[PDB]
């Protein structure tokens, strides 16, 4: 499996993107948040946005650490753009409850769930 | 037979089998298929690292324009190494004839991405990155077409379902459209139609 | 069809309720569909 | 013709007539739940079956395309009375 | 506490269970025949551990292996859970 | 050496003597269109569908039944063999009736799928097609007999299977008809199992007739229950439930056949299931209440109750999963007494010694067999796919099979040896004219029954058993490595309550009666409340509960085999399992899943929450139920047999006689078709 | 250009972005559709399914229909061999059980051994 590579030869171009990345995030939730007319602070997004990086931890290939990136590039240059719109920024929230439960006890009553 | 049957071609099978003979000696580097059906359209099958020499060489080289371009499609296939098939299909406009340039691939390892030889297939190549996944390298804009913004899975999967992940509807709580797990309102009662006895003998595989 | 009065079929309509949609005297939806798993009765008798 | 739930409503002819507290009947409000009051059962009741006189004949229903394909029934038994499987109406035999 | 039960999961072959077939055929009717109300257990599918386990008091189950011992360290964890 | 060359179009192939035309095909990846041919039953040329032309033959030959002689080649493209099909095809469609619509293998016809693929198209023929008559066959059978093609299928299945031979065939010619002469009902076992075997839409189910169709069920795999056996079953549910069941093949075990109480046995499992927790009501009255309130109340009250008075009698249809998570729930209280319905009776360690207590022959070695000799039950009612595969070895490689115990129902020419246990005795110590071919023998298997066991005669008669064995296995000029004493049970979670070693029956309850206890799946007559002390409390656990349930104090609606993933066991040790058909209707949780709630809402807990972890703690209880769908046998008859010798009895001078003696008898004596509708009105027909 | 390798498994299971209860809890069935017994033939075999467990589906509270909130339910993944399937499973993430193939054990037939002199084969009808 001598796999040709995307953008990076090891793990260290791939933290290298994936911080800057990270980087244009975090400059880039203030425009967008004033511009958009939202109703959450520019904190709670900026929390979500790590929040979004801390969810895939378990990412080891550097194919798909590269892929990642160039998903979060293409998502940067769609909200950039007002190509997206607030329904798809509110839908990166999870706002509207679905408080759908975790409990056994509550997987029990509410049930017929694993 | 003389009604009812469509009837085959010779000399243009001749001359299709004599030309996918041609191309497959004088190009040793990227071969492996040529193979005519019964219909007479040329199939060549090609290992994916000489996407833009064949497509350069099948530009030119005056005994073989094909300066119209079809469809790329990568058709999607389990069971496999490679998954993936791009589904190149060319017409000649000096000449009346019809190739398919057949290269396979994998679900991550790109190809040279042929939109600098074909302008055409710009946004086809956008259009089955968002269908498919097959990362296109050296290629100017990567966005999404023929799905929407926020959604994503590559549609066209034999893993994703039929129905989607997604489901969208309105709330005045918060005065926009929300999304949801999907909640079909009916079952779509899949028809199992496979037939036994053995429907057509000609294509037996050796059984295992 | 005053060419052609008659038919010998007897089981139509001769009222014509017509068009209706927007009265109190319209069609409603409900399954022709019996009970499907008929739960266990509970017994009428007392024990204990 | 429709008969008498303990609901003072119409039944249907095959039974799925709604029991005392469905609540299905609170969303059958103030409109009609329509029913066809001609039944199926009500006219095979006044079907003179005919007497033909061979063994095993033949149905069609009134003419070939208008109707359902040749069934061919039997007149052995005399105590059955032979009944196609598409028209619905019986048929005898005399000798 | 109360000295409820006893397992032992055995095999077709390794070294330590070869081991443990040279304790059932020498040494096995001695437990049962001087312990009526002390029901061992034995269990065998195919290929495993030759775990010799033991759940007494009020759901504890000790847990020792019997890969490559002896019979007399089978007698000896034996007494040691006796 | 018996290594025979035919070509199939050229290609070559190495073929046995004897083996036909049609396994070359078969071998070579072809199939040779057929009807009155069938791979598991016998053979005869009548279809005439499978001709087949040979290079440099000029006459066409039925491929059904060839004796293939050394060097052959076969033609299946050629000229007139697809012209000798079509004309076949052209014949076996014109006395057959348009019904192609109200037929009911619509979807799954042979007629249908070779017209297609071999036939021709414009027909001829263009008056008569004489109709026949029908009958009916049973209750449960619909019968046409105008459909029939006249293949001759189920009447040599009758024949060298059924044993009832009451299916020939009257009239010639053109006027043949199929089935019964003297007009007499067809009420036997495995009447259900020539809907399977019918090619055409003749011979149908009653009770499932007109309430589906093929192309929109899907199917999921199933285990047969009711019986120890487990064919590879098939529930073909529909529309958010279930609809249709079949059988399917297995390698060694119950080849392409079903218990037609199994295959009927789908109303009752969806008839008047249990379906809401219920308490009882301050009048008495049992009345249902949400799961929060119910099973407080039941976990409050196991917060007071310990000591060994707390019992749990797992009858009838219970799961892995109910077994692991009732043993580990009543271990992790204090302490526990587990109980079964059906005692087993132990004197000299039957619960562990793994042998003792299974089949332990191979269920496909029967045919491997010579001497087989079965005491007391009555084998065609208790698992009767192993009865029809022991007359299928019988009638191929000639059985010789004995009887002791009780003179039965039984249609294979049995020998039979003194209806009685102290003649077993006699036999294992004294001579008899079956005993000198029995000692002397080669292949020594003794099927032992499980109606007779209840009684206290089980220490003795099993050590006689355990003596035949040790006789003739050290006996015979052999060492072993083929067995004997094989023994057989009628509930799988009998089998799986021993395989984790689980106190035997109700006795520990009969010695301490118990103060709170859990009835999972109460039908037969264990207990009764006015056998038991003041403290009347009992959870009941199961599904269309019959008897015991207005008997009860908290009704808990458990899921059936349908609707949980749950491991079983057959007879012989081999785990299979199920999948989640259905979900369960009403509330109606699985049954370590109300467990581990039950825990939770109780002071404790259990250490597992998904089937991963439940599958982890099986292998961490015992390892021989994750390798599926492999054989285990089990040794050490020796150690058996010198544990065996504490506690013997003088026999019972009563000769032991089966509550399986009839028909109607295997048909009420289950709670599935103590529920049905159907088995009510087969009864009532078998009796009017 | 001959980049290095590395003995692991693939990792698309967040690059699809199916949700995480449709990740982990399907617990996939591979098996072997086998022969359809109320018809004759095999040539529905040979092709190893990959399907999903099924989950609840009910009422319609209009129609009785079978409504259900399963994408994962009308799944069918075809696959020819074996090693294949678990190299696809392990590469888009979940797990799975597996069925045997179990096919026809050739017996020995003749209508010549239907018939007997001194055999107990007698079909007496034919
Ligand atoms: S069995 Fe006969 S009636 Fe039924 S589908 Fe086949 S051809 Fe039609
Ligand atoms: S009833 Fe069915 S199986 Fe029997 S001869 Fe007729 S078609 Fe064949
Ligand atoms: S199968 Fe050979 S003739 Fe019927
Ligand atoms: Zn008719």
Redesign the pocket.
């Given at each position: 499996t001598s796999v040709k590579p995307i953008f990076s030869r090891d793990m260290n171009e791939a933290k290298r993107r994936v911080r800057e990345l990270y980087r244009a995030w975090y400059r880039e939730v203030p425009n967008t948040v004033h511009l958009f007319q939202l109703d959450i602070s520019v904190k709670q997004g900026r929390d979500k946005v790590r929040e979004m990086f801390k969810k895939n931890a378990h990412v080891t290939d550097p194919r798909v650490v590269d892929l990642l990136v160039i998903k979060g590039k293409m998502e940067l240059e769609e909200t950039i753009n007002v190509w997206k719109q607030r329904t798809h920024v509110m839908r990166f929230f999870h706002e509207t409850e679905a408080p759908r439960p975790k409990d056994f006890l509550s997987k029990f009553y509410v049930g017929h769930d694993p | 037979t003389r009604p009812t049957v469509r009837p085959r071609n010779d000399v243009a099978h001749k001359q299709l089998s004599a030309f996918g003979e041609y191309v497959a000696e004088i190009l040793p580097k990227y071969v492996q298929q040529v193979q005519v059906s019964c219909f007479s359209e040329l199939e060549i099958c090609i290992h994916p690292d000489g996407v833009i020499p064949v497509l350069t060489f099948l530009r030119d080289h005056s005994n073989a324009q094909f300066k119209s371009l079809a469809d790329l499609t990568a058709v999607d296939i389990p069971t496999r190494q490679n998954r993936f098939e791009i589904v190149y299909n060319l017409l000649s406009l000096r000449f009346n004839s019809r190739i398919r340039v057949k290269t396979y691939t994998d679900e991550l390892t790109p190809v040279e991405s042929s939109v600098s030889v074909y302008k055409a297939a710009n946004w086809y190549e956008r259009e089955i990155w968002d269908m498919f996944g097959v990362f296109f390298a050296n290629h100017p804009d990567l966005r999404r077409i023929l799905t929407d913004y926020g959604f994503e899975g590559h549609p066209f999967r034999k893993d994703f379902p039929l129905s989607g992940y997604v489901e969208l509807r309105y709330d005045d709580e918060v005065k926009r459209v929300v999304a949801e797990p999907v909640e079909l309102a009916q079952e779509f009662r899949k028809f199992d139609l496979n037939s036994p006895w053995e429907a057509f003998p000609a294509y037996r595989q050796p059984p295992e | 069809p005053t060419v052609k009065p008659p038919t010998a079929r007897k089981f139509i309509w001769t009222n014509h309720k017509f068009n209706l949609s927007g009265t109190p005297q319209q069609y409603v939806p409900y399954s022709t569909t019996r009970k499907k798993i008929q739960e266990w009765v509970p017994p009428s008798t007392p024990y204990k | 013709g429709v008969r008498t739930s303990p609901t003072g409503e119409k039944v249907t002819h095959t039974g799925q007539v709604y029991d005392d507290e469905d609540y299905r009947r609170v969303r059958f409000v103030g409109r009609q739940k329509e029913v066809n009051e001609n039944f199926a059962i009500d006219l095979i009741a006044e079907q003179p079956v005919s007497q033909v006189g061979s063994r095993v004949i033949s149905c069609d229903g009134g003419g070939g395309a208008l109707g359902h394909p040749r069934v061919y029934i039997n007149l052995d038994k005399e105590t059955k009375t032979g009944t196609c499987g598409y028209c619905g109406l019986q048929f005898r035999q005399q000798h | 506490l109360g000295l409820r039960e006893i397992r032992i999961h055995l095999c077709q072959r390794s070294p330590g269970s070869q081991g443990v077939r040279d304790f059932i055929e020498k040494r096995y009717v001695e437990l049962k025949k001087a312990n009526p109300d002390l029901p061992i257990l034995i269990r065998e599918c195919s290929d495993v551990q030759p775990k010799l386990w033991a759940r007494y008091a009020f759901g504890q189950e000790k847990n020792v292996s019997l890969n490559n011992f002896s019979a007399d360290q089978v007698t000896r964890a034996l007494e040691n859970v006796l | 050496s018996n290594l025979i060359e035919v070509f199939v179009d050229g290609q070559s192939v190495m073929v046995e003597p004897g083996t036909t035309v049609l396994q070359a095909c078969e071998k070579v990846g072809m199939q040779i269109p057929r009807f009155c041919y069938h791979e598991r039953l016998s053979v005869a040329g009548n279809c005439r569908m499978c001709l087949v032309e040979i290079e440099k033959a000029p006459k066409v030959v039925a491929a059904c039944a060839m004796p293939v002689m050394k060097g052959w080649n076969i033609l299946t493209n050629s000229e007139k063999t697809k012209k000798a099909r079509e004309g076949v095809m052209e014949f076996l469609?014109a006395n057959?009736?348009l019904?192609?619509p109200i037929?009911?293998?619509?979807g799954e016809?042979?007629?249908?799928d070779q017209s297609m693929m071999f036939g021709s198209d414009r027909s001829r023929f263009l008056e008569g097609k004489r109709a026949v008559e029908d009958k009916n066959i049973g209750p449960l059978v619909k019968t046409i007999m105008t459909?029939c093609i006249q293949c001759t299928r189920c009447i040599r299945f009758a024949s060298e299977i059924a044993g009832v031979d009451d299916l020939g065939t009257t009239g010639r010619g053109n006027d043949m008809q199929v089935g019964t002469y003297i007009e007499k009902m067809f009420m036997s076992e495995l009447s259900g199992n020539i809907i399977d075997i019918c090619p055409?839409?003749?011979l149908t189910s009653k009770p499932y007739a007109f309430t589906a169709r093929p192309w929109e069920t899907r199917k999921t795999e199933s285990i047969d229950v009711m019986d120890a056996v487990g064919s590879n079953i098939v529930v073909s549910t529909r529309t958010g439930e279930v609809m249709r069941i079949l059988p399917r093949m297995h390698e060694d075990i119950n080849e392409e056949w079903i218990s037609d109480k199994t295959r009927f046995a789908y109303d009752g499992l969806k008839r008047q299931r249990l379906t809401e927790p219920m308490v009882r009501n301050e009048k008495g009255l049992l009345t249902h209440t949400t799961w929060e309130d119910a099973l407080s109340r039941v976990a409050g009250m196991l917060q007071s109750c310990q000591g060994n008075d707390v019992a749990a009698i797992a009858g009838g249809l219970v799961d892995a999963e109910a077994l692991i998570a009732l043993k580990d729930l009543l271990n992790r209280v204090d302490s526990d007494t587990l109980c079964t319905e059906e005692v087993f009776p132990t004197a000299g360690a039957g619960t562990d010694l793994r042998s003792n207590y299974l089949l332990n022959t191979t269920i496909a070695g029967v045919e491997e067999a010579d001497v087989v000799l079965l005491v007391g039950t009555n084998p065609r009612f208790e698992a009767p796919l192993f009865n029809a595969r022991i007359r299928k070895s019988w009638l191929h490689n000639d059985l010789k099979v004995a009887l002791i115990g009780s003179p039965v129902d039984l249609t294979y020419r049995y020998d039979h040896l003194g209806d009685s246990p102290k003649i077993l005795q006699d036999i294992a110590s004294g001579s008899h004219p079956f005993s000198q071919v029995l000692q002397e023998a080669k292949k020594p298997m003794v099927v032992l029954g499980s109606s007779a066991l209840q009684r206290n005669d089980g220490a003795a008669i099993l050590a006689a058993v355990s003596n035949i064995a040790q006789k003739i296995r050290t006996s015979s000029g052999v060492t072993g490595d083929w067995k004997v004493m094989n023994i057989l049970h009628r509930i799988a979670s009998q089998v799986a309550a021993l395989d984790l070693g689980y106190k035997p029956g109700v006795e520990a309850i009969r010695k301490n009666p118990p103060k709170m206890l859990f009835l999972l799946g109460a039908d037969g007559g264990c207990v009764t409340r006015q056998d038991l002390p003041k403290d009347c409390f009992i959870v009941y656990q199961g599904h269309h509960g019959d008897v015991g349930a207005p008997i009860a104090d908290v009704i808990l609606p458990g899921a059936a085999y349908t609707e949980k993933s749950a491991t079983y066991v057959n007879t012989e040790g081999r785990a299979q399992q199920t999948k989640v058909a259905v979900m369960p209707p009403g509330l109606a949780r699985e049954d370590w899943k109300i467990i581990r709630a039950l825990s939770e809402i109780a002071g404790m807990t259990l250490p597992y929450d998904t089937l991963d972890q439940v599958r982890n703690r099986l292998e961490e209880v015992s390892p021989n139920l994750v390798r599926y769908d492999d054989v285990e046998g089990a040794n050490y008859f020796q150690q058996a047999s010198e544990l065996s010798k504490l506690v013997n009895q003088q026999l019972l001078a009563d000769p032991l006689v089966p509550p399986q003696l009839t028909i109607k008898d295997f048909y009420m004596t289950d709670s599935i078709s103590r529920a049905s509708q159907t088995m009510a009105k087969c009864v009532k027909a078998v009796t009017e | 250009t001959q980049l290095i390798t590395v003995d692991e498994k693939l990792d698309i299971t967040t690059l699809t972005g199916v949700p995480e209860e449709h990740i982990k809890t399907r617990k996939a069935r591979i098996f072997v559709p086998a022969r359809n017994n109320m018809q004759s033939g095999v040539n529905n075999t040979k092709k190893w399914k990959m399907e999903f467990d099924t989950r609840e589906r009910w009422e319609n509270p209009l129609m009785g229909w079978a409504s259900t909130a399963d994408p994962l339910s009308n799944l069918v993944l075809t696959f020819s061999t074996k090693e294949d399937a678990i190299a696809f499973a392990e590469k888009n993430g979940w797990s799975y059980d597996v069925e045997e193939r179990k096919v026809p054990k050739p017996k020995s037939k003749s209508y010549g051994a239907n018939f007997s002199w001194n055999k107990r084969t007698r079909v007496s009808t034919k």
């Open positions: - | - | - | - | - | 469609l057959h009736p019904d192609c037929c009911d293998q619509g016809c042979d007629l249908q459909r055409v839409g003749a | -």
